[PDB]
Amino acid sequence: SMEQVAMELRLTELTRLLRSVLDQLQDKDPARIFAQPVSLKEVPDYLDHIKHPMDFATMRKRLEAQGYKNLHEFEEDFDLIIDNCMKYNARDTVFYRAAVRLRDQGGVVLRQARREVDSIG
């Protein structure tokens, strides 16, 4: 149908906008602490602690399969990255501190993305 196509065009534009958001968020992690999943070879107990692991590469695979229906789903995944880190790592660690920073700096980008998603429909 013509409708399904219009729908698919919006998802594709949402995907385009979310890709730009994702690159902006990931620039706020210049150390690449959140780039890749936590290694289960190197942290074998990790899933005893964290039930829903997340990272920027895993978000990117989902993004490119157009797997985010709306900004809210994307934000959920970004928040997992931050929240998992803040639980698994103690406060006085480079990792925890890196999450605090990504959260604070990401909020600006996420604020505008919400306005652009509402604005452009």
Swiss-Prot record:
Tissue expression pattern: Highly expressed in testis.
Organism from which the protein derives: Homo sapiens
Subunit (UniProt): Component of some HBO1 complex composed of KAT7/HBO1, MEAF6, ING4 and BRD1/BRPF2. Component of the MOZ/MORF complex composed at least of ING5, KAT6A, KAT6B, MEAF6 and one of BRPF1, BRD1/BRPF2 and BRPF3. Interacts (via PHD-type zinc finger domain) with unmodified histone H3. Interacts (via PWWP domain) with dimethylated and trimethylated 'Lys-79' on histone H3.
Listed name of the protein: Bromodomain-containing protein 1
Residues of the full protein shown: 555 to 674 of 1058
Domain of life, source organism: Eukaryota
Cross-link Glycyl lysine isopeptide (Lys-Gly) (interchain with G-Cter in SUMO2) placement: 41
Gene that encodes the chain: BRD1
Chain ranges of the Bromo domain: 9-113
Primary role: Scaffold subunit of various histone acetyltransferase (HAT) complexes, such as the MOZ/MORF and HBO1 complexes, that acts as a regulator of hematopoiesis. Plays a key role in HBO1 complex by directing KAT7/HBO1 specificity towards histone H3 'Lys-14' acetylation (H3K14ac), thereby promoting erythroid differentiation.
Location(s), subcellular: Nucleus; Chromosome
